[PDB]
Design a binder for this molecule. Structure first.
Ligand SMILES: *[C@@H]1O[C@H](CO[C@@H]2O[C@@H](C)[C@@H](O)[C@@H](O)[C@@H]2O)[C@@H](O[C@@H]2O[C@H](CO)[C@@H](O[C@@H]3O[C@H](CO[C@H]4O[C@H](CO)[C@@H](O)[C@H](O)[C@@H]4O)[C@@H](O)[C@H](O[C@H]4O[C@H](CO)[C@@H](O)[C@H](O)[C@@H]4O)[C@@H]3O)[C@H](O)[C@H]2NC(C)=O)[C@H](O)[C@H]1NC(C)=O
Ligand SMILES: *[C@@H]1O[C@H](CO[C@@H]2O[C@@H](C)[C@@H](O)[C@@H](O)[C@@H]2O)[C@@H](O[C@@H]2O[C@H](CO)[C@@H](O[C@@H]3O[C@H](CO[C@H]4O[C@H](CO)[C@@H](O)[C@H](O)[C@@H]4O)[C@@H](O)[C@H](O[C@H]4O[C@H](CO)[C@@H](O)[C@H](O)[C@@H]4O)[C@@H]3O)[C@H](O)[C@H]2NC(C)=O)[C@H](O)[C@H]1NC(C)=O
Ligand SMILES: *[C@@H]1O[C@H](CO)[C@@H](O[C@@H]2O[C@H](CO)[C@@H](O[C@@H]3O[C@H](CO[C@H]4O[C@H](CO)[C@@H](O)[C@H](O)[C@@H]4O)[C@@H](O)[C@H](O[C@H]4O[C@H](CO)[C@@H](O)[C@H](O)[C@@H]4O)[C@@H]3O)[C@H](O)[C@H]2NC(C)=O)[C@H](O)[C@H]1NC(C)=O
Ligand SMILES: *[C@@H]1O[C@H](CO)[C@@H](O[C@@H]2O[C@H](CO)[C@@H](O[C@@H]3O[C@H](CO[C@H]4O[C@H](CO)[C@@H](O)[C@H](O)[C@@H]4O)[C@@H](O)[C@H](O[C@H]4O[C@H](CO)[C@@H](O)[C@H](O)[C@@H]4O)[C@@H]3O)[C@H](O)[C@H]2NC(C)=O)[C@H](O)[C@H]1NC(C)=O
Ligand SMILES: *[C@@H]1O[C@H](CO)[C@@H](O[C@@H]2O[C@H](CO)[C@@H](O[C@@H]3O[C@H](CO[C@H]4O[C@H](CO)[C@@H](O)[C@H](O)[C@@H]4O)[C@@H](O)[C@H](O[C@H]4O[C@H](CO)[C@@H](O)[C@H](O)[C@@H]4O)[C@@H]3O)[C@H](O)[C@H]2NC(C)=O)[C@H](O)[C@H]1NC(C)=O
Ligand SMILES: *[C@@H]1O[C@H](CO)[C@@H](O[C@@H]2O[C@H](CO)[C@@H](O[C@@H]3O[C@H](CO[C@H]4O[C@H](CO)[C@@H](O)[C@H](O)[C@@H]4O)[C@@H](O)[C@H](O[C@H]4O[C@H](CO)[C@@H](O)[C@H](O)[C@@H]4O)[C@@H]3O)[C@H](O)[C@H]2NC(C)=O)[C@H](O)[C@H]1NC(C)=O
Ligand SMILES: *[C@@H]1O[C@H](CO)[C@@H](O[C@@H]2O[C@H](CO)[C@@H](O[C@@H]3O[C@H](CO)[C@@H](O)[C@H](O)[C@@H]3O)[C@H](O)[C@H]2NC(C)=O)[C@H](O)[C@H]1NC(C)=O
Ligand SMILES: *[C@@H]1O[C@H](CO)[C@@H](O[C@@H]2O[C@H](CO)[C@@H](O[C@@H]3O[C@H](CO)[C@@H](O)[C@H](O)[C@@H]3O)[C@H](O)[C@H]2NC(C)=O)[C@H](O)[C@H]1NC(C)=O
Ligand code: NAG
Ligand code: NAG
Lengths: 302, 302
């Protein structure tokens, strides 16, 4: 076309926008205008003369600048978009003598959301009813921002409310039946929105609590009378960390010749036909006490 | 209005026309255009710059001039109208920085007729069937010229044929039962047409022929024997003029003591009891012979 401009542009709230316009005609140029039309009425915006400088109209006076001082780039950046810039703007080029041609660009206003991740309120213990683990918030976005979680470990869901301003807020609530096998999993809501030159992401690790989980190693196949220096450790994974890890013998009695370094159980005396009892360590955290036992047998070969 | 121009103007074929346009705005002016639009396409006509002179477009190049060298009278005379100037022309004023406003004027083409009066072909004798006395011709007028006769002495009538060119010719035939009492009457067709700043008229006198019309004066009440020096003139009005005006006595006989000076009849001898006859002069023209007589009586008192 005689005047080439890109149409259907989109400008971001509060930020600026470059309204490119170029006029490569072997014709000699005498005036250069920009006009936003309110309906059938043409409010002028910017004007460039080769003799009588520039002109910027009220109320655009502060918020428009000419990117090029040449008679050829009608290119202008509109400083600081508001809502009311949503319309059709035409670039009027006056030549001598063809008259004037015009090209239009329709700019739609577009406002960013502001995102937030918020820890769901109830704590996530093991094997309990569905719980809300996290809420992702895309605030006052126009158009409605969009949302998506990457965990495939539970269920998305969202309620979205919209405004007079012709923007909206959606809130995605991520929920799961919590299991300890999901300890420290990365939950992450991505939010995709037109005005996001690169979509924005917010991340989480799951903190699932659970009851203690205990397992004593130490007893290999057979323990023979007089075997010297063998142990039992009360290995246990729990969250929160536990506090109590008492090392009781189920047969109420408890012989000497034992000690409980760390939570290992030492038999610092060589083995006797004593000791022949079912040993049980009992580990306790915020969520309660759990225990495991190893049936200890002392034997002797021919 | 911002730009004041007169609308719905009418331009006369072959002649010129002034397209007035004036732009009294306290705004400073930067370009001045005239554009005839063919449908939705704007062929520029004239352009005025305060720096880079004038411009006249093809093919208007010869036929347009700027009536005012000022930046304020877009007034132009379009030299030599043809048919194809029948349309809407707009005057474009470019200011700095309002942009541009425009006012339109719709010029309809209008061609003069050319008028003629032509003597109807058959001659007008007296008391004959209606005859066509004159034909008035309004030729190739656009729109159809109009016609009217002023004589109230017969009947108008007209046949009007129209053309491709979107002009027409009407021919009014004026007809009457001709009577001699209408000799030398002014018949006149007026032709009224939009393009005639003062309507045009063509005039005629009627030339009605007639048979001769005769009347002898001379005989007063009584003529007495011996009365000295009395005459009879053969007064007669006819058209065409007559040629023969013989002065015969109906009683075949014709005494001496008479003479026919001019067409008076002298009795140069004092009256006798002769002369006592019915005297008749016979007048003859193109249309034939007519006559009148006076019964002459000579008497004598006691
Ligand atoms: C296990 O969790 C189950 C789901 O709970 C979830 O997890 C929690 C932590 C949150 O994250 C929450 O968002 C999750 O949904 C839970 O099962 C649920 O039990 C409750 C009842 O105790 C149900 O709520 C009731 O829902 C009905 C729905 O009625 C219909 O219409 C509504 C629209 O209004 C639709 O949305 C529904 O699909 C239905 O078609 C309500 O009518 C009802 O309202 C009541 O309270 C109002 C108060 O004004 C009264 O006026 C009414 O008369 C009712 O009494 C309840 O809100 C819930 O729907 C149900 N299932 C689900 C899938 O949510 C279960 O309790 C947990 N297991 C336990 C505790 O053992
Ligand atoms: C006295 O003058 C009378 C009128 O003549 C006028 O004066 C002359 C000098 C011219 O200026 C002339 O323009 C004036 O009109 C005259 O009376 C007329 O006599 C003739 C016949 O001798 C009539 O002509 C005939 O008219 C008829 C009309 O028929 C109808 O249709 C036509 C349309 O076609 C209408 O216009 C009429 O109103 C009727 O409704 C014709 O049909 C006819 O055509 C004939 O000739 C063609 C030749 O192809 C044949 O095909 C047909 O068969 C016909 O034979 C005639 O043309 C005339 O109308 C009539 N009256 C008037 C008012 O004109 C009269 O003769 C004179 N007195 C004398 C000579 O003693
Ligand atoms: C879209 O367009 C907008 C604005 O057109 C751009 O954002 C602009 O960013 C500039 C640069 O930061 C802003 O101008 C800055 O103003 C600062 C504040 O001025 C002072 O006012 C008085 C001065 O006495 C005091 O209150 C105080 O000193 C304030 O600072 C200046 O400080 C900045 O000066 C800078 O330049 C000078 C010149 O060398 C340096 O000496 C300084 O170190 C400093 O770098 C500057 O002038 C402007 O206000 C912003 N406009 C806004 C907010 O709308 C966007 O960047 C642009 N967007 C894109 C993507 O292009
Ligand atoms: C179209 O329509 C919607 C709905 O009306 C607008 O959304 C509102 O936007 C404004 C501004 O973004 C929001 O108002 C802000 O509230 C903040 C909350 O402050 C705290 O205290 C409140 C209690 O009242 C708590 O709820 C909250 O958690 C916070 O702890 C204020 O901090 C903001 O004020 C800030 O700016 C001012 C001026 O610069 C400073 O003086 C302050 O110090 C502070 O920094 C502000 O008032 C409002 O909450 C939004 N409503 C929503 C999201 O529902 C959209 O703005 C509008 N869209 C467009 C594009 O204009
Ligand atoms: C609408 O506009 C039209 C034209 O624009 C007007 O009509 C014009 O009338 C002018 C004046 O008569 C015409 O121009 C005249 O041309 C004549 C012919 O030029 C010569 O060409 C060569 C020269 O060597 C020879 O064949 C021969 O000499 C021809 O004459 C000139 O003779 C005229 O000269 C006159 O001015 C000079 C200057 O002083 C005098 O010395 C002379 O004595 C003489 O007066 C003259 O230049 C023009 O052609 C017409 N245009 C046409 C026909 O379209 C209408 O009047 C106007 N209508 C209205 C109502 O405004
Ligand atoms: C739209 O349409 C109509 C219909 O076609 C046009 O009307 C014609 O117009 C032209 C020009 O006016 C007329 O043609 C002229 O004829 C004249 C007649 O000359 C004599 O000889 C003829 C025999 O052929 C006799 O019938 C007649 O009585 C004359 O005795 C010519 O003299 C004209 O030529 C003249 O100009 C040329 C060039 O300048 C010179 O060289 C000559 O010497 C001479 O001066 C001319 O040819 C024609 O008769 C019209 N037809 C009609 C009236 O039915 C309209 O012109 C048109 N309308 C418009 C606005 O353009
Ligand atoms: C205002 O607009 C003009 C014209 O659009 C911009 O012109 C830049 O001018 C330079 C030099 O005149 C052009 O680059 C040339 O590239 C050759 C490489 O062969 C180099 O040798 C020259 O030195 C020169 O750099 C360039 O085409 C042109 N840029 C554009 C986008 O057209 C100018 O940048 C603009 N000014 C401002 C302040 O924005
Ligand atoms: C071109 O257009 C101009 C402006 O329309 C025409 O201006 C004529 O200029 C004269 C003098 O400048 C004006 O008349 C003034 O009248 C007073 C009477 O008080 C007299 O004292 C001055 O000497 C002068 O004559 C007049 O207003 C103006 N005419 C019009 C129609 O506006 C000018 O005539 C045009 N030029 C040509 C060549 O057509
Ligand atoms: C085992 O220890 C107990 C202490 O309760 C002691 O009375 C008993 O004699 C011991 N038995 C053996 C075989 O060492
Ligand atoms: C009248 O004149 C005639 C000539 O024809 C003549 O014979 C006669 O005598 C005259 N009569 C009188 C009274 O004069």
């Amino acid at each position: 076309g005689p005047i080439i401009v890109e149409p259907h542009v989109t400008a971001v709230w509060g930020k600026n926008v470059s309204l490119k316009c170029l006029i490569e005609v072997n014709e000699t140029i005498t005036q250069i205008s920009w006009e936003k039309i309110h309906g059938k009425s043409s409010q002028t915006v910017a004007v460039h003369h080769p003799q009588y400088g520039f002109s910027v109209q009220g109320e655009y006076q502060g918020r428009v600048l000419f990117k090029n001082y040449s008679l050829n780039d009608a290119t202008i950046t509109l400083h600081n978009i508001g809502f009311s810039d949503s319309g059709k703007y035409i670039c009027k080029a006056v030549t001598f003598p063809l008259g004037n041609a015009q090209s239009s660009t329709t700019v739609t206003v577009l406002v960013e959301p502001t995102v937030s991740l918020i820890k769901g309120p109830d704590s996530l213990i093991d094997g309990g009813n569905e719980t809300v683990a996290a809420i992702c918030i895309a605030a006052t976005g126009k158009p409605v921002a969009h949302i998506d979680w990457e965990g495939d470990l539970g269920e998305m869901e969202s309620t979205t409310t919209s405004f007079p301003n012709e923007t909206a807020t959606i809130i995605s609530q991520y929920k799961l039946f919590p299991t300890r096998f999901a300890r420290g999993r990365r939950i992450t809501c991505v939010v995709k929105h037109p005005a996001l030159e690169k979509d924005i992401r917010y991340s989480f690790i799951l903190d699932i609590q659970y009851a203690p989980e205990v397992s004593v190693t130490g007893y290999d196949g057979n323990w023979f009378v007089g075997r010297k220096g063998v142990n039992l450790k009360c290995n246990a994974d729990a969250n929160p960390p536990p506090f109590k890890s008492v090392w009781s013998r189920l047969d109420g009695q408890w012989p000497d010749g034992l000690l409980a370094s760390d939570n290992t159980l030492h038999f610092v005396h060589p083995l006797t036909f004593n000791y022949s009892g079912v040993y049980i360590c009992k580990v306790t955290n915020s969520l309660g006490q759990r225990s495991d036992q190893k049936v200890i047998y002392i034997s002797d070969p021919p």
